[PDB]
Design a protein around this ligand. Structure first.
Ligand code: MG
Ligand code: MG
Ligand code: MG
Ligand code: MG
Ligand code: MG
Ligand code: MG
Ligand code: MG
Ligand code: MG
Ligand code: MG
Ligand code: MG
Ligand code: MG
Ligand code: MG
Ligand code: MG
Ligand code: MG
Ligand code: MG
Ligand code: MG
Ligand code: MG
Ligand code: MG
Ligand code: MG
Ligand code: MG
Ligand code: MG
Ligand code: MG
Ligand code: MG
Ligand code: MG
Ligand code: MG
Ligand code: MG
Ligand code: MG
Ligand code: MG
Ligand code: MG
Ligand code: MG
Ligand code: MG
Ligand code: MG
Ligand code: MG
Ligand code: MG
Ligand code: MG
Ligand code: MG
Ligand code: MG
Ligand code: MG
Ligand code: MG
Ligand code: MG
Ligand code: MG
Ligand code: ZN
Lengths: 138, 53, 51, 120, 89
RNA sequence: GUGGUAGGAGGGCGCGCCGGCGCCGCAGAAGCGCAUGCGUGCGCAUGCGUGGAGGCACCCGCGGCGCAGAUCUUGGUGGCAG
RNA sequence: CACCCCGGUGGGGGAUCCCUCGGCCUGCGCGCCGGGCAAGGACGCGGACGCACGCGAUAGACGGCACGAUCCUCAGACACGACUGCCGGUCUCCGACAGCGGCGCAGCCGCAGACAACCCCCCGGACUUAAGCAUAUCACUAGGGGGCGGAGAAGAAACCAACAGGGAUUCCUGCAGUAGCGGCGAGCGAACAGGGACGAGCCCGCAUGGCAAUCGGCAUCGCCGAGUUGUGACAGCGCACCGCGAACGCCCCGGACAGGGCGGCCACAGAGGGCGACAGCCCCGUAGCAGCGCGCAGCGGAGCGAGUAGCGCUGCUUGGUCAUGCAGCGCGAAGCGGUGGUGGCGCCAUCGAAGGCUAAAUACGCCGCAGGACCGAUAGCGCACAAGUACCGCGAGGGGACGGCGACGAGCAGCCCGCAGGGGCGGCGAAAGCGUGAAACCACCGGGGCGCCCACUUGUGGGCCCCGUCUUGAAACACGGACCAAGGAGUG
């Protein structure tokens, strides 16, 4: 159960918070699980998906494909993976929008200061695990 | 009519209690239904239309 | 009517620049549910109250 | 963000006044090229915004300068006083609300607050 | 005579733009706005319960009030440049 | 023993939601159309078609709970009438 | 042949059902406008920009801080920080002046205007009820005027009482639909208690005389001013306030798994939402976890309240009754006075008016938050949508309608014809192609010719006037009803 009265379990307010989320929150809601090889290194369950992330598709038509993330679109919540495509009539290949929950990150991009952001979540997870270890010790 | 008290083992009988006299009360099913009807509307929250509507 | 105050002409100009269709590049934007300008005003059907 | 704020903090207030006039001139030359020729779409946007950026740094330097000028003034300018609320500016101070007559002072002094615990 | 013929003569315009409330309600002869009551100092007592919903406070931009809600929410710390200068001394 | 207006009473049918309890549904829910069956009757169940995501039954409880009428309300559509 | 009925297909229309970023209700929180230019308005501001929304010549993200990679229709922008968040700057003009007022006042300030739910003051109806109606009632309401605040107002007894006495106000319970008022009709109608919430008490005036010991202003330790027609006193505040959060695989069906089947796992987490169907383990989340400090000093205390109280008259008011309150006018006090459900007088009892302040419990809209046996697009707010919009009115004002493809990946123009709209073969997709698609009604096709009931061998016979309604009596030359869907009336 949720014992916090100040947060909603309301469906209407949770649905309005999803579709009128701002761009900072929409980045967090577009998280994707890591692989087990990434989770032994980083420790955290999931991370918000970014361009140039290697990704294996976990559900849908392209399930089992690997490819890089070539486009993230926060409005309409869709991640576009390289080699997950469909053609138009005029032969133009369009990337097919996949939800971030259906993607698993194989290799994390680390270029544009993202290695700092991964290590910030990794260290805060490690520090908070140390506090909960001491509290259960006492 | 005596009841067993089990450990968290779930098989070992720790005590043997007598049945409390509450659990031997002959049940008046109408009375429990009559009380349930009024108890159910203790958290009954109000609803109304707007007075301007 | 060719003689007007400064306030009348500014309100008449503001009514005039407003009276134009949706720009055609807006029809390609996502979430654009507007197809024509419903607040278009024609000079003979719709009157302005600029006195 | 063609003109960065990092360079504008180094300039002085009158040096930012001349820069905003010089940048306003270039905006007029940009509005000329927009009417006569084509432009990159956000050139007028960018030059409009760094005029605003120069003038903001001018204002932020001027609030800092005028504060240290009239810091120890009997009446500071109204710009540099905190804009609470007209009602909150006209409120009595906490010193003024604590003001009491001599009998209330002597009584609180002669019979001060006691700290005690009861048990039966 | 009484109807269709008489509507041809209605080419005067008695109620012009009010400089306070901007409705076409400032009378020229009376020199008083029928909507807001300009030039009386207080606003005219609005002629309907819905007239507050159309013209009252909150139906406009609330340019100062939206700023003072935001400052009150943060504790009236005021000007961010002067905030650090009062904090240093 | 068997009519029945005004009228009173009883027992049910039906609707929105509730606390339960039995279940059903992308191998197709509700709704709808046409059939068949059950039913004194309110109504119910099924088949086929459509539909594309919910629903049913019963026991309980709450009620803005059942329409042919009100020069009813709103919407739609006819005849008039090429 | 037309006409009618039934079915099929296609129209037509938008019912139904499912949905819902909306409403409604309740609780809680907040309770913060204004010459520092408010509310509201006007006009402008986007590279291509109408509306909406945002904004103010710093005009469609200006700065700081946080965030960290997209925004997107084109073009472009972007780690020299995209998209965002929080806060601050900038913040045009109209709109608060014939201004008014305070302070010795080189000058410095205030008032105005908004808000109208709550609260305070004044003004003050009528419909209505009385089966008429005039007093009464509605109602000391609605409404208008004025005025505040985050609450307000009230408030430390000229009180209640009649006891063995209680002890500010406010609120709840209760007294009590009672005593009482009332064409004693209709109706109206309190108080002390008892119980409780909450609790809190204070002050001015008659302050020294071996010296105003007090205050305001300044260009400030000195002037000037106030003031002897009399000035005079400090106990309470403040900062800090996180980031992380467990656990799932395979098979089947399908466009897609969150479904089914099998097997696990986590749980201080099985609230909820998202994700291509119904997810504890995919995601967002959820359970879970973090504090403190700094202050309080002195010198008068019996001061006391008048055009008042009260009485008389009048008008209003009240449950207030030979007057409850309030006001006006006449009269006008006292050292003792007021009061004792309210005639006078006397007793006894109980308080000290005509000066002032005072938290808390109490009330409440907008707004924020959270909920709900509420409503689910003719419902629910007037508005789930470019809603107080379009639009109408000289004006005060009046005021709608309109929701839904999909995996937001595809959904096209290849060929033939047409000036074209388009048609036909195709094309994409699981399908729909801005969900479902009822009825009225219509086209065509097929079948059949009572409008109904009965009977059977289905076209004959027999029985049937038009329903609703008021009425003694309706098929009525009584009234309502073109049709259909939806809505629609004994409730609290
Ligand atoms: Mg003219
Ligand atoms: Mg005309
Ligand atoms: Mg004339
Ligand atoms: Mg005239
Ligand atoms: Mg009978
Ligand atoms: Mg009957
Ligand atoms: Mg049902
Ligand atoms: Mg049923
Ligand atoms: Mg009803
Ligand atoms: Mg009907
Ligand atoms: Mg009827
Ligand atoms: Mg017609
Ligand atoms: Mg037919
Ligand atoms: Mg409709
Ligand atoms: Mg509310
Ligand atoms: Mg302004
Ligand atoms: Mg910026
Ligand atoms: Mg005022
Ligand atoms: Mg009435
Ligand atoms: Mg009467
Ligand atoms: Mg009557
Ligand atoms: Mg009468
Ligand atoms: Mg206020
Ligand atoms: Mg008060
Ligand atoms: Mg009364
Ligand atoms: Mg004195
Ligand atoms: Mg987690
Ligand atoms: Mg008098
Ligand atoms: Mg006495
Ligand atoms: Mg007595
Ligand atoms: Mg007193
Ligand atoms: Mg509907
Ligand atoms: Mg509606
Ligand atoms: Mg007219
Ligand atoms: Mg359709
Ligand atoms: Mg009769
Ligand atoms: Mg008759
Ligand atoms: Mg009849
Ligand atoms: Mg006749
Ligand atoms: Mg008729
Ligand atoms: Mg109906
Ligand atoms: Zn006006």
């Amino acid at each position: 159960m949720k014992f916090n009265k100040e947060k909603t379990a309301s469906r209407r307010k949770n649905r309005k918070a999803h579709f009128t989320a701002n761009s900072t929150e929409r980045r967090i809601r577009m998280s994707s699980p890591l692989s087990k090889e990434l989770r032994e290194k980083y420790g955290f369950r999931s991370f918000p998906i970014r361009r140039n992330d290697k990704v294996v598709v976990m559900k849908g038509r392209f399930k089992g494909n690997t490819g890089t993330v070539v486009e993230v679109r926060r409005k309409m919540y869709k991640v576009y993976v390289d080699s997950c495509e469909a053609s138009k009539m005029n032969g133009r290949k369009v990337r097919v929008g996949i939800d971030a929950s259906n993607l698993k990150i194989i290799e994390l991009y680390q270029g544009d200061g993202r290695d700092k952001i991964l290590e910030r979540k990794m260290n805060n997870r490690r520090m908070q695990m140390e506090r909960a270890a001491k509290i259960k010790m006492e | 009519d005596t009841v067993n008290c089990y450990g968290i083992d779930g098989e070992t009988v720790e005590k043997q209690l007598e049945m409390p006299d509450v659990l031997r009360v002959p049940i008046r099913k109408d009375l429990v239904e009559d009380a349930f009807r009024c108890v159910r509307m203790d958290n009954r929250q109000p609803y109304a239309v707007s007075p301007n509507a | 009517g060719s003689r007007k105050t400064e306030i009348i002409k500014t309100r008449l100009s503001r009514a005039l620049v407003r009276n134009r269709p949706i720009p055609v590049w807006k029809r390609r934007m996502r979430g654009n549910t507007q197809q024509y300008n419903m607040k278009r005003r024609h000079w003979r059907r719709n009157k302005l109250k600029i006195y | 963000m063609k003109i960065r704020t990092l360079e504008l903090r180094e300039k002085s207030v009158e040096e930012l006044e001349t820069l905003a006039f010089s940048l306003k001139e270039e905006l007029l030359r940009l509005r000329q090229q927009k009417n006569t020729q084509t432009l990159k779409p956000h050139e007028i946007r960018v030059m409009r915004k760094n005029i605003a950026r120069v003038l903001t740094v001018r204002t932020e330097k001027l609030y800092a300068e005028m504060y240290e000028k009239h810091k120890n003034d009997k009446r500071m300018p109204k710009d540099l006083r905190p804009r609470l609320t007209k009602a909150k500016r006209m409120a009595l101070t906490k010193r003024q609300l604590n003001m009491s007559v001599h009998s209330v002072c002597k009584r609180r002094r002669a019979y001060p607050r006691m700290y005690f615990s009861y048990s039966e | 005579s009484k109807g269709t013929s008489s509507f041809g003569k209605k080419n005067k315009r008695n109620h012009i733009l009010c400089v306070r409330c901007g409705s076409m309600s400032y009378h020229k002869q009376k020199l008083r706005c029928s909507s807001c009551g300009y030039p009386e100092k207080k606003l005219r007592n609005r002629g309907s319960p819905k007239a507050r919903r159309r013209r009252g406070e909150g139906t406009g931009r609330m340019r100062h009030l939206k700023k003072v809600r935001r400052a009150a929410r943060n504790g009236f710390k005021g000007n961010a440049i002067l905030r650090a200068l009062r904090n240093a001394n």
